[PDB]
């Protein structure tokens, strides 16, 4: 079925197989799901339905849609542009690490499965050469599993501080260059989709996730990992970090407030069903996130079983959990290098598809907003090459010895936290109060046939902005510092630059409001009347 194959080619992504178990292990195991399902019900469905319906209604790019829906709140589009720029900066480095893992995979013995190399320290131990072994005192002397040592001391060569930026890793730089040039190849030759290439590269991630889950439940001692994954702690619910990270994991995995969802709506015709597609896409995305959570948490439960250390601190808990638990899982398969290279090629495919659609949405929005310059002299591909070069040069600051902290900062403060919360708040205020939810419900009735069931309407008015503003204020007043491996206590200038770019991602809305008020002034009531009123027939 063409409908089943194309939809399944969009449910999976790196935000479900890499970011969700990272956020579910850093911010408490079982306590992450309680604000996960709340935002899933109250902010995933309504805002996903809102952005898809607005994109299909206006049927154009992601920032001029907000121009013709509400010219006052046109700054919501530019914030999504800045979020897209930050994502395209840091969503390609994950593919660089997966390429580096793919480069080292083609060997009869896996690099992350032995306790002897140039990077393995004295406190290493095999954890496989003997059953009872000689641990429980080596663990007191900080015993470390070989994959946990391999990732740090060879993949990125971690340093003891963000102020300790070491030499740039040239192998990772060539990996990033390969990732950017294959993304540019996908831009030029590869837009012509369908054929025999979609029946293979869409069902492949589900087969691999199924076999990885089947292995993960077969791993001994995974009951402890699943219990840690499911049983919640209320003391781990008392902090705002869990709520913020769960809400913005909902917003990130669904591409909510990123900016490409308005472009997704414009691709469909005027009479496509928003409600059924939104419901089934969101439910299947949450389901595959839940399945990947099962797989990784069972694997690290087995890791904590085979070590003497408990579950809470057995992996990195930074954004390399999918690069630590999953390569640990593939070591136990028969014919391990084949499964490892198939896994890493899966990661390349499902990261490259999302990076492709992100950069394509960004470039088509920036050439729709600049129509007379980039559509007359055959320079759209030149702009794509320039954007790729610029994002490759700005992205290289993370590839150093100490750039992992910079990557963690931009991951938690660019397409996450206050940026996504602010954009969702202002989006829902715009639709529910400025454009009018009755008018938008009438537009949805004219589009798909039936109005929203008024639960989504009341979510647009009072539920979603209320809960997101509550989470915003709760994070603001009770500030908690961010720690990389759950204990780092970042320097103040790192928090300063993270908050600076998080502001610059979200201060574009009131700045655009201010310059729109100043540019066309007819005193306050005429200004608000002429800015509230939409443009043309939409």
């Amino acid at each position, epitope marked *: 079925v063409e409908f089943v194959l194309s939809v399944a080619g969009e449910i999976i992504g790196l935000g479900n197989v890499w970011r969700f178990p990272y956020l579910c292990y850093k911010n408490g195991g079982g306590a992450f799901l309680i604000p996960y399902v709340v935002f899933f019900i109250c902010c995933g469905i309504p805002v996903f339905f809102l952005e898809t319906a607005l994109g299909q209604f206006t049927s154009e790019g992601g920032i001029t849609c907000w121009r013709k829906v509400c010219p006052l709140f046109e700054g919501i589009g530019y914030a999504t542009q800045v979020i897209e720029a930050h994502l395209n900066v840091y969503y390609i480095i994950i593919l660089a690490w997966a390429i580096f893992y793919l480069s080292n995979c083609f060997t009869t013995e896996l690099p992350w499965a032995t306790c002897g190399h140039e990077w393995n320290t004295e406190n290493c131990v095999e954890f496989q050469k003997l059953n009872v072994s000689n641990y429980s005192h080596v663990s007191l002397q900080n015993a470390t599993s070989p994959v946990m040592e391999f990732w740090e001391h060879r993949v990125l060569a971690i340093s003891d501080g963000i102020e300790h930026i070491g030499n740039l890793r040239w192998e990772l730089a060539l990996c990033l260059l390969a990732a950017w040039t294959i993304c540019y190849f996908c831009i030029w030759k590869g837009t012509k989709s369908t054929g025999k290439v979609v029946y293979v590269t869409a069902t492949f991630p589900y087969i691999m996730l199924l076999i990885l889950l089947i292995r993960g439940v077969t791993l001994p001692g995974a009951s402890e990992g699943i219990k840690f994954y499911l049983y919640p702690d209320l003391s781990r619910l008392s902090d705002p970090q869990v709520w913020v990270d769960a809400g913005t994991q909902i917003f990130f995995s669904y591409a909510i407030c990123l900016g490409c969802l308005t472009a997704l709506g414009s691709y469909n015709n005027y009479h496509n069903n928003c409600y059924r597609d939104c419901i089934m896409l969101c439910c299947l995305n949450s389901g595959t996130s839940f399945v990947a959570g099962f797989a990784i948490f069972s694997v690290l439960g087995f890791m904590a079983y085979e070590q003497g250390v408990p579950i809470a601190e057995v992996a990195e808990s930074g954004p390399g959990l999918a690069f630590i638990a999953y390569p640990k899982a593939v070591t136990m398969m028969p014919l391990s290098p084949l499964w490892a290279t198939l896994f890493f090629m899966m990661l390349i495919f499902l990261g490259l598809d999302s990076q492709f659609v992100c950069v394509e949405s960004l470039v088509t929005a920036v050439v729709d907003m600049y129509p007379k310059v980039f559509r007359r002299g055959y320079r759209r591909e030149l702009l794509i090459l320039a954007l790729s070069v610029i994002s490759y040069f700005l992205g290289l600051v993370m590839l150093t010895e100490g750039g992992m902290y910079i990557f963690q900062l931009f991951d938690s403060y660019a397409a996450s936290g206050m940026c996504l919360l602010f954009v969702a708040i202002f989006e829902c205020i715009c639709i529910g109060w400025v454009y009018g939810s009755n008018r938008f419900s*009438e537009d949805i*009735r004219d589009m798909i*046939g039936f*109005p929203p069931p008024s639960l989504i309407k009341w979510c647009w008015m009072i539920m979603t902005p209320g809960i997101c503003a509550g989470i915003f204020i709760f994070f603001l007043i009770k500030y908690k510092p961010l720690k990389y491996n759950n204990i780092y206590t970042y320097p103040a200038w790192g928090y300063g630059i993270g908050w600076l770019m998080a502001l610059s991602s979200m201060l574009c809305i009131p700045l655009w409001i201010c310059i729109t008020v100043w540019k066309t002034e007819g005193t306050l009531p005429e200004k608000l009347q002429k800015l509230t009123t939409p443009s043309t027939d939409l």
Partner: antibody
Framework: EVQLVESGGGLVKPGGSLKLSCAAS????????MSWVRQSPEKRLEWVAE????????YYSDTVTGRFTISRDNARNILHLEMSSLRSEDTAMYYC????????????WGQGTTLTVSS | ENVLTQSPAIMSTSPGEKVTMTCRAS???????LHWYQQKSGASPKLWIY???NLASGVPARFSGSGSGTSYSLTISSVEAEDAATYYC?????????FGSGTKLEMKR
């Protein structure tokens, strides 16, 4: 419970004009779209017009477009349908249907005002 | 103009007898947009079957629509004296909206 009572209608001259009025009660008139359905004296049913729940999405059939206008009033819970240049072919008995969800249909109908055009 | 036609225009059914109407569509219509009505002799039509499978409030369960694509049918198990009327089929897929020709359910004795 819900009464889609209708007024207006009667004998009109050919080429004249008439103003049919449909009054709704027992429900939120501003939350459900409205349509006018006519029934020919040969007992043939056809759709005339449709206005949305707000009043800006207006559709017509190809037999009445240009001469027929449809209005709305969410304050007094009333509906209108004004016609011009009535010929001998658009004589019927007009119903005031109510259809908002397109997967539900015209669930609640009116009574029907007999309309006659003759010389 | 999705010209819908129904055959036969006139029909006669004994009580407790199988009966199946039809509603042929000119162009393709959605499976969830085609409706069925029932107008008694001297009364306003009421919604009978919506989205060709469901039933409106108060409709007995012996009515059951079927079909998809362009060929749609209305099946009644055991008719009685309470449902002698005319049935029309509508579509909301394409504009302008069209109705069926109408099948008159008659009784013999």
């Amino acid at each position: 419970e819900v009464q889609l009572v209708e007024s207006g209608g009667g004998l009109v001259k050919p080429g004249g004009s008439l103003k049919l009025s449909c009054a709704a009660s027992g429900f939120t008139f501003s939350s459900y779209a409205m349509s006018w359905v006519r029934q020919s004296p040969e007992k043939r049913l056809e759709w005339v017009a449709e206005i949305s729940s707000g009043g800006r999405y207006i559709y017509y059939s190809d037999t009445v477009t240009g001469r027929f206008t449809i209005s709305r009033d969410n304050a007094r819970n009333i509906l209108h349908l004004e016609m011009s240049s009535l010929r001998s072919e658009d004589t019927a008995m007009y119903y005031c249907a109510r259809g908002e969800v397109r997967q539900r249909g015209f669930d609640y109908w009116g009574q029907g005002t007999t309309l006659t055009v003759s010389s | 103009e999705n010209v819908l036609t129904q055959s036969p225009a006139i029909m006669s059914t004994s009580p407790g007898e199988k009966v199946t109407m039809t509603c042929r569509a000119s162009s393709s219509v959605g499976s969830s947009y085609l409706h069925w009505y029932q107008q008694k002799s001297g009364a306003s039509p009421k919604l009978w079957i919506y989205s060709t499978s469901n039933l409106a409030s108060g409709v007995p369960a012996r009515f059951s629509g079927s079909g998809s694509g362009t060929s749609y049918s209305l099946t009644i198990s055991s008719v009685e004296a309470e449902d002698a009327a005319t049935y029309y089929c509508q579509q909301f897929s394409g504009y302008p909206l069209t109705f069926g020709s109408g099948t008159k359910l008659e009784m013999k004795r």
